[PDB]
Subunit: 316 residues, 6 copies
């Protein structure tokens, strides 16, 4: 049941940004570190029991010389095609969602499902500099340069760069999408790259961290709480929250300049409604938030229609 701010308060919830003074410089230097690594994209054809599509394993190199991979599915016909980069949930990829990628291609989109470094298939070359609570949320959290989501966000940008370089994709008709973690990555990618034409984010994660750790009732935001339990110095908490502020999509949101479609379920206890309204209310672009009273952190059939209609409009 309902548990967060009531809808009327959610609609006006817009916390002050927490971006440090060197927020832009950190992202600039981070993109510059990415650019020093040659992508060297590699496509390996893959058998799949469906006609009308060609499937591949796509691998490229990214931040920290990390090998990143995923399924890439293309309509079996003359291009150029509209394209989608799809990002997945936290610890929530099962053999890379190949069937979903094929279905996207059958809807007419050349689609790459980036697999998140350290979670599924893709390599995380970044070390564990100081020890962390169980999970990825606090890996390297004592420094922006070492934080887990630095590499992840840069990988998400590189995925767009790679897909746009292909002859069979129409570089002008590329979308980004995903749910929860995948939703955060969607907003981060649109904030950090000119490439995407449109974005659809399902109940995005990695937003309004300061509120998230006080309101969430399930994992994985509570890993942050677990880390503070195990590393109890007051200074550690201040540093950790500062680090998180560089990756908080509510702080990246103002950079987004493409149309955005977003969902939230009002009984969602993983990505609490307030945290999602926070990101949405910091967007200054063509946008729409679809609110679903009786849904939580889960597939919403009605939003699937909205998502398909939105990409059909902006990408075809």
């Amino acid at each position: 049941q309902l548990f967060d701010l009531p809808l009327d308060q959610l609609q006006t919830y817009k916390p002050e940004k927490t971006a440090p003074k060197d927020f832009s410089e950190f992202w600039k230097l981070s993109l510059e570190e990415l650019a020093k690594v040659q992508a060297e994209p590699d496509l390996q054809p893959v058998d799949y029991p469906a006609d009308g599509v060609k499937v591949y394993r796509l691998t490229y190199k990214s931040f920290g010389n990390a090998r990143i991979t995923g399924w890439y599915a293309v309509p079996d016909k003359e291009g150029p095609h509209p394209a989608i980069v799809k990002y997945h949930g936290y610890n929530a990829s099962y053999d890379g969602e190949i069937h979903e990628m094929v279905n996207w291609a059958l809807h007419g989109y050349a689609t790459f499902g980036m697999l998140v470094r350290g979670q599924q298939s893709s390599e995380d070359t970044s070390i564990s500099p100081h020890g962390h609570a169980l999970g990825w949320m606090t890996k390297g959290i004592l420094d922006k340069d070492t934080y887990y989501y630095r590499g992840v966000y840069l990988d998400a940008v590189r995925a767009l760069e790679v897909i746009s370089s292909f002859d069979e994709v129409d570089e002008t008709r590329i979308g980004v999408t995903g749910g929860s973690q995948g939703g955060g990555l969607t907003i981060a990618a649109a904030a950090l790259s000119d490439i995407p034409k449109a974005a659809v984010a399902d109940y995005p994660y990695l937003s309004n961290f300061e509120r998230a750790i006080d309101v969430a009732l399930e994992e994985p935001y509570l890993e942050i709480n677990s880390f503070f339990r195990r590393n109890g110095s007051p200074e550690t908490e201040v540093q950790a929250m500062k680090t998180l502020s560089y990756f908080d999509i509510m702080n990246l949101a103002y950079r987004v300049k493409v149309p955005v479609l977003m969902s939230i379920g009002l009984i969602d206890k993983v990505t609490p409604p307030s945290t999602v309204f926070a990101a949405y209310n910091h967007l200054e672009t063509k946008k729409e938030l679809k609110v679903y009273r009786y849904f939580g952190h889960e597939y919403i059939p009605a939003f699937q229609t909205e998502k398909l209609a939105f990409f059909k409009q902006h990408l075809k």
Copy 2:
């Protein structure tokens, strides 16, 4: 974690059939009652945000003059096409799985998602003769003529009759599929109709009721137990179990004479592995059972590949 018979015992588990002497005659007479109702199919176009497919709402008349309905999606190209009738889980259809139906059409199959009477969209004209435990499992359970699944099984047969009558479907290349309740309906359809060429049943429900009510740890087999708690006469329990034996797919399985592909997860607490192995082991036809150690009553990615390859082989 593991809980049913160990694998080596599952593989040989073949309970004695519980079909009463008038089993066949019951079904013959039930099919005769269906035949008296003219199908009178009606198709209504649906505006759906996808190319390559035409989407409809299909409605027809069935047993007891009931109005049964569901989404029907068709490849947007000259037929005739291979076809699929897809059946859904107990209390588990959310606006009829329209998106899944479209995806099946984009994989090349004219596909109808039959919606189960009284659960989702479709009408259940059968009354509640005697009072039942919360749910549909014990609705009319005191008589085979009034039992809930009588009308459901007949609707499932009528769905095939209707689809195979369409000009754009290749009547010789029709598949049936579904999971849990949907898997039970798949097996029941193939057993009660010559129309299906092939069948894929995910962890089928409605099997080996006698063991199911003693071994299941989750709903909905346990509704039967709930009914017995509320209606405790010993004669009532015997009568209810005999009713159920007419619908038990382990008793119908000997009629199936098309290829069958089936799945089971070994930690499945809803449809316990033993109940699924019982239906499987009562099949005498080309068959395969895919066993997944680490999965329960849920989507199994690896099995979707097998499902697609199996329909590719038999319908194309």
Copy 3:
């Protein structure tokens, strides 16, 4: 523990009525449909190991030609007797509570325990016109004429009509009582019939639906939520809530003209305190609400004393 409005706010909680403009006409037409069915009451004597009482199975015909039944127990002595119609909880009858009915008779009341159509023993002839979430709460919810509780409320009225027709009952000394669903039926019956002399309702269900589905933390109000999950159109939700408004006892409450005794447990999560205070605060008749801080949705021993004292006063 405490979870709803604090007591001081509960005592003044009186939501605006949600009755549509044709509320009275719908009930008038509904009672007229009931009157067209001849009751044809039938009494079958029953063995029971107690002296001083005569037990029967009573059956009568009601709305939609439905066969309704229950245990009827009478003091074994010359009448006429004061009488009680007792209504049961949702899915909560176990072989009709025969022992409780006998105890009521031994307290000197000719007592009939109406069994709810489709739940226990009694027949529900009303169909499932459109499909519903697991349970009875959303059966026929898209239309007042087809809604499950239409037949149920009319049955509850007919029970009074039948009991009052008996030579051995004093038609002027008839009470109604029940808990949760049985409590709602108690208030509905007193609202729809002149027959009852007094009413005792334990934490009544079927009240203030709009608040109920936002505040309840257990079944069965949440079936409504489940239905909206499975049938997601905005228009479906509006229609469903309109339908419910005709059956909402907070809307029927003003019709009650007999003394009413009511209970509420402040930690009740099934029938939340606010929903019960809502019904109570809409009564304009001799009334009393007994509030129990440390009880939830359960038998309250202290209220049993109050109930017995209340019926002794008004019916003897």
Copy 4:
């Protein structure tokens, strides 16, 4: 769901008696200590809202000069009457079940609901000699002389002595009954006193302690386990089990020589079926055990009928 020995093994389960060589002498000496305390019964009228019965608060003195009390209800008619002493569940009396006691009187029985010392209303003058786990189960468990149930069992015997001394009770027609702890007290009373003519014990507690602490899945047998965790010397465990063996009803059952009716639900996790079958199988007297597949540690409607019929037969 099922969990103890299967039925066919329960039926023959007869653990070797664990009674120490001084078992009889302990009980003889304990009864001698009771006899030294003059009962000095006191009856105080109670205003209760029912006709046909007179209600009292009965108080008497027992083992250790303890003040034991409970409701005593009597038919409002010339006696002498058949009588019942009713015993209650562990920590499970709510204001002494006055309403149930009245109902027993209206069924024709002069009935006293003995309230257990230290649990409800009654005084426990026995000290806590050595410290115990949360609860009464391990209070004084290091010595048979100080153990909690010594005084309780003696109070239960004294309740019968007191009731049988009343002019209005037919001393030759006295029953004992109760469930769980109440069932254990029922068997213990019949074993320690010649006064009861008949006994009905619902799923009796305080049986086969050695198995109980290994098989029970719920409180309160598991208090014993909790005590052992808190007092881990091996000598302490041996001594505690030996203390318990003096009170284990499977060791007392061979003394019962009146008709016995007993119940067990096969999913009962509080008093596991094996523990109940052990007491039953140690009875050598007219006996019956009613087994209910679908019930646990709870009210069984069908068994109430058997209970009433059984007392009708033996007390009337």
Copy 5:
């Protein structure tokens, strides 16, 4: 997660005292009853695998001639030594925490861990005058003179008296400490005895009872709620809360005249933050409350440092 008053409201939460007019007289008479019992301390040496310490079982006589005991560990060197009396959690002593007592001695403190009468090792001679809910919280709760914590508080005072009488302890350098129940005992002892020089209380229990029973989400404050369920008269609740008021440390707090160090975890559901801030805010002495956002009712490593530093300062 967070559940009580927000921190800013906690810091100013100071409920009106609930001490009856004869509060001081009751404690005066209670201490006078204690003084009539000669302590007769007895020390029995005990083997323990550690050098640098001497271990003993200490036993003394207290209120109601009760035998109270515990482990007493002394540095193996010439005294006099600073000393500590350590009090334990409710039902939370496992063989008296001998290892912890030895560690205190190895930190240089002659340390006695008083074991709570009736809970662990120590005798409770006080009777159960009226019956209580499962546990100790409502034992004797209908009268201040009979209430369980009367004897317990007096034992805690006597422990100080005994330890201060020893040649090897510096009577001027004695501390008291404990968690939850042990924390309440710490504050009660400092309120009732001049002996302690300093106090460290971890999230103290037995505070602000009126709020506790409305806010706590786990045992054992909810035993009070359980008692009111089983003993439902309004007068019983008033009496019980009056009794509790004499033992409420928020009422004893003003008597404390030594430095106090206290902890609270903001997600603590056993001793809710409000109840602990209530006691703290009623202290008028040198004091400090350490607040831990991410901890509940559990060991807090950072507070262990604070506790050690505090006793080192005040006792060495």
Copy 6:
């Protein structure tokens, strides 16, 4: 409650070793890689509120140039001293257990609490080559060279090398200890190094992986199962199990040639008794296994005494 093999079967449970033919060579080569990294130990004093001890933060370099650290506490007196290396539980170190380390020093032992790379304070320089399930258990599991526990086991060996090099430690009297993951590290250290004189392992983790993943009911063995769900190729499962067999302490145990003391609680659902008995039964050395019926995966007081007495005997 009980759940693994019964005790009589545990005592003889000795699974066949799963060590591959290159087991020894793997470990020899791994130790050679460690040896190439110069330890370069650094001690930094820490202000701690206790007399009789000097506290430090110890840091050294290990496998993969990783910075490993922990608290090192030493008796404040002329050495040389007996020493202990203490290893901690999975994800279970809270600021490195500084207080426990001090207590070990006050018991006379120069004690270092090695903190596990990537879990607490210590650096894990090993990458995530292929993606893993949430946790460390499946990090690098597709290759023995990259697996998480390779570096951990080598750090544990290096901790001993470092401590034994200190002037104030008696190199001939060094112990190892720890629980669960810490117990597994204890056994692995004694197996891979001649330095330890004695070992005490509480309910050791990382044993008999093949059974563990089928019998464990709690985290963290079940991460392996989670990995298999997310990476379902049959070849992946075989490879992962073979990797694990290099680290399985039941395969290392045959190398341990110092006295061993071990514990197991029979209700332990984390490290099931069978997995612990398997490691124990593969020991060929002076050994003892203490079995605790009533305890699970938790602090066992009685075992601490055994632990202290055992180190007293072997190190002093």
